[PDB]
Amino acid sequence: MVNVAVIGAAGGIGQSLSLLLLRELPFGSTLSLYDVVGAPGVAADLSHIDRAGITVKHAAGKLPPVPRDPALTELAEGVDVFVIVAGVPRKPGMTRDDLFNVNAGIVMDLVLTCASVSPNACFCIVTNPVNSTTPIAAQTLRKIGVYNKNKLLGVSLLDGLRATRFINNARHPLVVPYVPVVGGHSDVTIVPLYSQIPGPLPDESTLKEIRKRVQVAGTEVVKAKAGRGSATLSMAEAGARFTMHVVKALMGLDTPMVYAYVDTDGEHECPFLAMPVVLGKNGIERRLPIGPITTVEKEMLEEAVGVVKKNIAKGETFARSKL
Amino acid sequence: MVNVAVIGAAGGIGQSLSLLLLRELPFGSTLSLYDVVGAPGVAADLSHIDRAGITVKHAAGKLPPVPRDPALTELAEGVDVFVIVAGVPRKPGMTRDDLFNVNAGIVMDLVLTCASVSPNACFCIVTNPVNSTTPIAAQTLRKIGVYNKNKLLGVSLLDGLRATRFINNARHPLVVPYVPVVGGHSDVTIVPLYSQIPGPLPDESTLKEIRKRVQVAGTEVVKAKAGRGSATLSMAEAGARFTMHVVKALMGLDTPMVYAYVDTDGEHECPFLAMPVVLGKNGIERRLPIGPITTVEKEMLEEAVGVVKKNIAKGETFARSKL
Amino acid sequence: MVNVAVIGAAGGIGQSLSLLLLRELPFGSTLSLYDVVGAPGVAADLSHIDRAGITVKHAAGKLPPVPRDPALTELAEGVDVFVIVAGVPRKPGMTRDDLFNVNAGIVMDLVLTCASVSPNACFCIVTNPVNSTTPIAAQTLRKIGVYNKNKLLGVSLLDGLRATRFINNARHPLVVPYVPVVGGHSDVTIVPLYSQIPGPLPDESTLKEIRKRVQVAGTEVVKAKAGRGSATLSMAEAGARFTMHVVKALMGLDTPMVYAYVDTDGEHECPFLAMPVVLGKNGIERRLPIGPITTVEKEMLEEAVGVVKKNIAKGETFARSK
Amino acid sequence: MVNVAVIGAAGGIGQSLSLLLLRELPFGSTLSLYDVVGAPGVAADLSHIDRAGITVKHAAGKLPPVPRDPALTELAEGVDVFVIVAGVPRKPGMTRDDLFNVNAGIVMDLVLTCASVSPNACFCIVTNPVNSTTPIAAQTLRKIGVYNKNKLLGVSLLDGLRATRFINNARHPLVVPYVPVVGGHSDVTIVPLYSQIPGPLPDESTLKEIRKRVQVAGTEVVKAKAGRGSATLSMAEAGARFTMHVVKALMGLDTPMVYAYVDTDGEHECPFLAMPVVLGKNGIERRLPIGPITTVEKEMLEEAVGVVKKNIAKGETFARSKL
Ligand SMILES: NC(=O)c1ccc[n+]([C@@H]2O[C@H](COP(=O)([O-])OP(=O)(O)OC[C@H]3O[C@@H](n4cnc5c(N)ncnc54)[C@H](O)[C@@H]3O)[C@@H](O)[C@H]2O)c1
Ligand SMILES: NC(=O)c1ccc[n+]([C@@H]2O[C@H](COP(=O)([O-])OP(=O)(O)OC[C@H]3O[C@@H](n4cnc5c(N)ncnc54)[C@H](O)[C@@H]3O)[C@@H](O)[C@H]2O)c1
Ligand SMILES: NC(=O)c1ccc[n+]([C@@H]2O[C@H](COP(=O)([O-])OP(=O)(O)OC[C@H]3O[C@@H](n4cnc5c(N)ncnc54)[C@H](O)[C@@H]3O)[C@@H](O)[C@H]2O)c1
Ligand SMILES: NC(=O)c1ccc[n+]([C@@H]2O[C@H](COP(=O)([O-])OP(=O)(O)OC[C@H]3O[C@@H](n4cnc5c(N)ncnc54)[C@H](O)[C@@H]3O)[C@@H](O)[C@H]2O)c1
Structure with missing residues (x-):
C-alpha cells in the first residue's frame, strides 16, 4: 500500500505522531521508525497494538550520530513518504546560530541519506525553522540530481x-x-x-x-x-x-x-x-x-x-x- | 455532557492518552487535565488543536505533592470519569515492593480527593500494579462511604x-x-x-x-x-x-x-x-x-x-x- | 434520546431516507415510520437490519386517508423531529396548480395531527413546493398556537x-x-x-x-x-x-x-x-x-x-x- | 481503481443498493448501472449527489429484453465486481416453475454477457433462489471456460x-x-x-x-x-x-x-x-x-x-x- 517513515520517531512529536499514524494508515501499509536513540523501544511499544494489516519496521542509528547512517540507508528502501521530525535542543552556552547550524546539518544529512535510496518519495519537513529547512532540503535534493518540486512539503x-x-x-x-x-x-x-x-x-x-x-x-x-x-x-x-x-x-x-x-x-x-x-x-x-x-x-x-x-x-x- | 479527567496527564501515558481523548471525545465534552508537574504546558499544547466543541481545562498540583490537593478538589467538581494514570513506573534504587507502596499511596490520595467531590464518577485505574491498586481504590471509596462496585474499573x-x-x-x-x-x-x-x-x-x-x-x-x-x-x-x-x-x-x-x-x-x-x-x-x-x-x-x-x-x-x- | 418520525415513509423518497437514518441515527434513537400505504412492510423490512440500539416503530393510516388519522396521533407522541416527505409528486390529468392544492392539503393535515401531540418537535418540510408548503406549515402551527419560528425548516x-x-x-x-x-x-x-x-x-x-x-x-x-x-x-x-x-x-x-x-x-x-x-x-x-x-x-x-x-x-x- | 456494476440497478433492491454504494465506495471508484428499464433515470438521480471521486456510468438494455444485450457488453468492459440483482415478478398465470425458469434464464444470460467481456470479475449473486442461481452462474461460467470457484459469491x-x-x-x-x-x-x-x-x-x-x-x-x-x-x-x-x-x-x-x-x-x-x-x-x-x-x-x-x-x-x- 504505502511505506511511511518517521525520521526522529522517539522524539516528543515523533512518538505521538507515530501512534496516530499507526491508528490511521490504511490496512496494508508499513510504518518505518528511525531514530539515533529510542527507536527499538518505540517500535516494540507500537507493535503490540492490535491494528491488523500494519507492518511496523524500525532501525536504530549509531550514537554518537554518523553521517549517512547505514541503518537509515536500509530502512529508507521502498519508502513513499519521509516525515522529518528530528532535532536537537539548544543546550546552555549554545547561541541561536549554533542551534540553527546543528538542525540545518541534521536535515541535510537525513535528506541526503533517505533520497539517495528513495529519490521518488515525498519529503515532509517538520524540523524548524521550516522557512529555512525546506529550501535546505531542496538544495540537498538538487545536489544529488533528484529534486521534484511537487514532492517537497514544509509542514x-x-x-x-x-x-x-x-x-x-x-x-x-x-x-x-x-x-x-x-x-x-x-x-x-x-x-x-x-x-x-x-x-x-x-x-x-x-x-x-x-x-x-x-x-x-x-x-x-x-x-x-x-x-x-x-x-x-x-x-x-x-x-x-x-x-x-x-x-x-x-x-x-x-x-x-x-x-x-x-x-x-x-x-x-x-x-x-x-x-x-x-x-x-x-x-x-x-x-x-x-x-x-x-x-x-x-x-x-x-x-x-x-x-x-x-x-x-x-x-x-x-x-x-x-x- | 461528559467531563473526563486525566489524573497524571503530563506523563508518558497521560500525554498521548489525553491527545487521543481530545480527538475522539463527543462534541460538547470537557477534558480536564491534572498533574503535579507540566499540567499547564500540556493543556496549552492540546488547547491549540482545532477540535470544535471540546473544552480543555487543567489544574497544577503543588510540588512537593500534598495530600488532598485543593487544585485537584476544584478540577474534580462535575467530573463523570476519572482516568488515574499517575504513578511512578520505575526509580533507580527502588524495588517492585518500594514501587507498590509509592503507587498505592498515589492511588489512595487521588481517589479520596476526587471521590470526596464527585462520588458518582466512574474511576478507571491504570496505575500499576492493577491487581492491587483496584482493590486499594475500592477500600478508599468504602472509607468515605461512597463505594459503587459498578463504577470502579481496573484497566x-x-x-x-x-x-x-x-x-x-x-x-x-x-x-x-x-x-x-x-x-x-x-x-x-x-x-x-x-x-x-x-x-x-x-x-x-x-x-x-x-x-x-x-x-x-x-x-x-x-x-x-x-x-x-x-x-x-x-x-x-x-x-x-x-x-x-x-x-x-x-x-x-x-x-x-x-x-x-x-x-x-x-x-x-x-x-x-x-x-x-x-x-x-x-x-x-x-x-x-x-x-x-x-x-x-x-x-x-x-x-x-x-x-x-x-x-x-x-x-x-x-x-x-x-x- | 431522539425519536425521528418519517411521515410518508413508504414513498420513493421516504423508503431510502428511512434506510439512511436507520444506518446513521445515534445509538439509542427511535425511528418512527408512518404512511397511508405500505408502512407495515417498510417497517418489517427495516426492522431486520442489525442496527443495535435503534428502535423501529410504525403506524398504518386508513384508506381512504382521513383528516387526523388516530394511528398517526398515537405514533406522534414523544417525537422530536417530523420529516414530512408525504405528497403527490405527479398524477396524469393534474396540472401544477392541482398538485399544489393536493400537496398543500396533505401538509396542513399532517402538520396539524403531529403538532397537536408533539408541539415542541422540529418540522422538516420536504413536500414540494417548499416555497409555499413551509409557510403553510407555519400557518397550521399558528392555528393551534404552537408556532416556533426556530423549529420549522424547509428542506x-x-x-x-x-x-x-x-x-x-x-x-x-x-x-x-x-x-x-x-x-x-x-x-x-x-x-x-x-x-x-x-x-x-x-x-x-x-x-x-x-x-x-x-x-x-x-x-x-x-x-x-x-x-x-x-x-x-x-x-x-x-x-x-x-x-x-x-x-x-x-x-x-x-x-x-x-x-x-x-x-x-x-x-x-x-x-x-x-x-x-x-x-x-x-x-x-x-x-x-x-x-x-x-x-x-x-x-x-x-x-x-x-x-x-x-x-x-x-x-x-x-x-x-x- | 474498482469498477462495480449493479445489474438490475432500477429495481427495488438495485436503487437503494446503488445509493449506498455511491456513498460508501472508495474515492476513485466507478459505479456502473445497468437495467432493461429505468437505468438512465437512476444514473441521472445518483449523478446529482455531491460525492467527490465517484464516476457514475450507465447503460440501458433493449425492451423487450434480448440475450447478449450490446449495451451490457460495452458497460461490462473493465468491471471488477458484478452485483446481479435483476429479476421479474410472478404475474397471475405463471407457476412457481414459470417464476424460477424466467429468473434462472435472466441469471444465465447476464452472467454469459458480462463474463464474456470481464472473465476475471467477481460475481455476487443476489437474484433468488440463491441456492439454485449460484450453481447456474457456475455452470454458465464453466461453458465459456472461465469459472473461478474463488470469484463466485452467493449473497x-x-x-x-x-x-x-x-x-x-x-x-x-x-x-x-x-x-x-x-x-x-x-x-x-x-x-x-x-x-x-x-x-x-x-x-x-x-x-x-x-x-x-x-x-x-x-x-x-x-x-x-x-x-x-x-x-x-x-x-x-x-x-x-x-x-x-x-x-x-x-x-x-x-x-x-x-x-x-x-x-x-x-x-x-x-x-x-x-x-x-x-x-x-x-x-x-x-x-x-x-x-x-x-x-x-x-x-x-x-x-x-x-x-x-x-x-x-x-x-x-x-x-x-x-x-
Ligand atoms: N513545523 C512545526 O510546526 C513545528 C512545531 C513544533 C516543533 N517543530 C520541530 O520539530 C523538531 C522536533 O521537535 P521535538 O519536540 O519532537 O524534539 P525532541 O528533541 O523531543 O525529538 C527530536 C528527536 O530527533 C532525534 N534526532 C536527533 N538527531 C537525529 C538524527 N540525526 N537522526 C534521527 N533522529 C535524530 C532525537 O534523538 C529525538 O528523538 C524540532 O526541530 C522542532 O522545532 C516543528
Ligand atoms: N496496563 C496497564 O494498566 C499499564 C501499562 C503501562 C504502565 N502502567 C502504569 O501507568 C502509570 C504511569 O506510567 P507512565 O509511563 O506514564 O509514567 P510517567 O512517570 O511517565 O507519568 C506518570 C505521571 O504521574 C504524575 N504523578 C505522580 N504522582 C502524582 C500525583 N500525586 N498527582 C498527580 N500526578 C502525579 C507524574 O508527575 C507523571 O507525570 C505507572 O504506574 C505504570 O506502571 C499501566
Ligand atoms: N427538494 C425537495 O424538497 C424535493 C425534491 C424531490 C421531491 N420532493 C417532494 O417529495 C414528495 C414525495 O416525493 P416521492 O417521489 O417520494 O413521492 P411518492 O408518491 O413516491 O411518495 C409519497 C408518499 O406520501 C404518502 N402520502 C400521501 N398522502 C399521505 C398522507 N395523508 N399521510 C401519509 N402519507 C401520505 C404516499 O402514500 C407515498 O408513500 C413530493 O412532494 C415531491 O415533490 C421534494
Ligand atoms: N439474496 C437475497 O437475500 C434476496 C432477498 C430479497 C430479494 N432477493 C432477490 O433479488 C431480486 C430482485 O428483487 P427486487 O425486489 O429488487 O425486484 P424488482 O423487480 O423490484 O427489480 C428487479 C430489476 O431487475 C431488472 N431486470 C430484469 N431483467 C433484467 C435484465 N435482463 N437485465 C437487467 N436488469 C433486468 C428489472 O427491470 C428490475 O428493475 C429477486 O430475485 C429477489 O427475489 C434476494
Missing part, C-alpha cells in the same frame, strides 16, 4: 490548526473546519486569512488580536511548558493529519486542498511560500492562487514575504557552504 | 490488544477484533482464552508460546527500552479506547462488552477479576460468566486466581494500614 | 448537493464540500453563490450554464425518467443529511451551519428565505447574513425574492381559505 | 443481519456484531449457529423461536408488504455491506471473514454451501471449517444439507438444458 498546518481553534472559540456556535494561513511558518511570516472563511467575523480590533495570537502561539506554548520546550501533542496532530493527506493523495483515495510551505514554481516572486495546493498521485497536482485578501492582510503578507526571502537566503547560504 | 485492555495482535500475526489473513483475557493483569495472572475466538487455532505448542508472550509482553518493551522505559504508546491506545467505551456507555451511545479488572460482586470466589462485563448508563450493567474454557486454560486460571487473591489481600492490607 | 439542501457536484465536476481535482444556495427552492428562485466558495471559478459564461443547470436540475431527472418519475435517491441523500444535522444539533453533538428555507424573523423583507443558519439544541440558534455577493448574484437574488414573495402569499391564501 | 448475508438483530433484541444490553449462518439461503436450509457467539444464550424456548424466525423472516416481510413483494431496504443494506467487503478485499484494504454461499471446493460433500470464508486480492483466499456445533444445530444442518443438494441439482439441470 505549516499547525498554524491552520491554531487559526481555526481561535476563530471558532471567538464565533461559537458558528464553526469552520479550516482557515487559510499563507506566507511562512514563523512569527511575523504567519498570515491567517480570516477574510476567506464564511460567516460574519468579529470586529477588526478582535481579529488583530487573534491573528497576532496565531503568530506568537509557539511562544505561548514554550512559556506554558516552563522549560519542557515547544509544542509536541498539537504538532503530532497537525503532522499526522498532513501525512494522511499525502498518503491518501498518493493512493488515489483523495485529492485534498492543503496549505503547505512549498516551492512556488514561478507562481510567486518568493521561491518558497505557505500557499494552497491540491495533492494527487504524484504529489502537488495544482498550485492555487492566494486569492482575494483585505488591505490589512495584503500589508501583513508584504511584510511576511520580505522576511521569508531572508529566511530562504539564510537556508541556501548554509546549504551551499556545506554541500 | 486491563492492554493484555487483550497484545493477545489480539499476536494471534492475528499468527493466523493472517484470518483476523479477529478482540480476544478474551481473564484473571489478572500481570505475568502469571494473565490468562488469554484463545479457545473462545472464531476459526482454527495453531498447534497447542504454538499457542503455549503465544500465551506466554502475552504474559511477559510488558518485559519485552522494558528490554527494548534498555531497562529505562516501559509501554506508553500502547497503554495510551488501550486507555483511550477503554475510556471511550465508558464515556459512550454513560452517554447511552453504546452498551459495549469489555474485559476489565472489576469487583466480581459474588459471581466468582475471587473478589476482583479480569472478566467480561457490559457497560451502561450506570457503569457495569451486567457481569458475564468467563464461559467454556479448555483444560489447559482451566489450569492457567486456577494458578492465576491463587496469585490474584494474594495481590488483592496485599492491596487491602496497605489500604487499611493507611486509611 | 432546500438538494440544491446545495447539485451546485456542489456540478462545480466539483468543472474544477476537478479542486473539491469543495458545499456551495451556498439562497433565495427559494424552485426554478428562478434558486440562487447558487459560487463567489462564496474557495479557489478560482470558471469564466462567467460557464458559471451561467452551471447556475442554470442547478435551477432546472429537477426537470433533468424527470426527463431521464420519461416524465414518469422524479429525483428520489438524491433527495433521500439530502433529506437524511439535513435530518442528521437537526438530530445532532438537538442532542448537542454539533452546531452545524446549514442552508434551509426558514422564517427570516425580521432579518429580511421576505418572510421566508433559503439562507444560512446555525442549528443548536432549540433548533435555529443563529440566522447569518447572506454575505457579500457579485452584481450578477445580486440581480439573480432580486428576481428570486420577487417570486418567493408570491409563492409565500399563495401558500398563506390556501391556508386561510381552508 | 446470503441478509440471514446474518436478521440472526444478529434477533439475538441482540433478545439479549439487550449484550450486543454481538454478527452471527454465523450456514447451510443455504432459504426456509429450512438456513442454520444460524448461536452456540458460536459470545455470552450466555436465552433459554431453549427463546432460541427455538429466534432460529425459526431467521428461517421464515423472508415470508414475515412478504406478508407485512401485503402484495408489494419481498425485502428491498434490508437486502440493499446486506448487499452493499457484502459488496464493500469484496471491494476492500480486491483493493488490499481488508481481509474480511464473511459468510457466503460458495463452491465448497471439496471441503464438504455438498458442492455449494453458506460457509465462512476469508476474502483477499483474488476473491476467496481461505475456506474455514463450519466449526463445533450443538446437537440441535447438527440436526438442523443435516436436514438443511439434504434440501440444499436438491436446490443445487435444480439449478444445474436447468443450466445444462439451456447451455
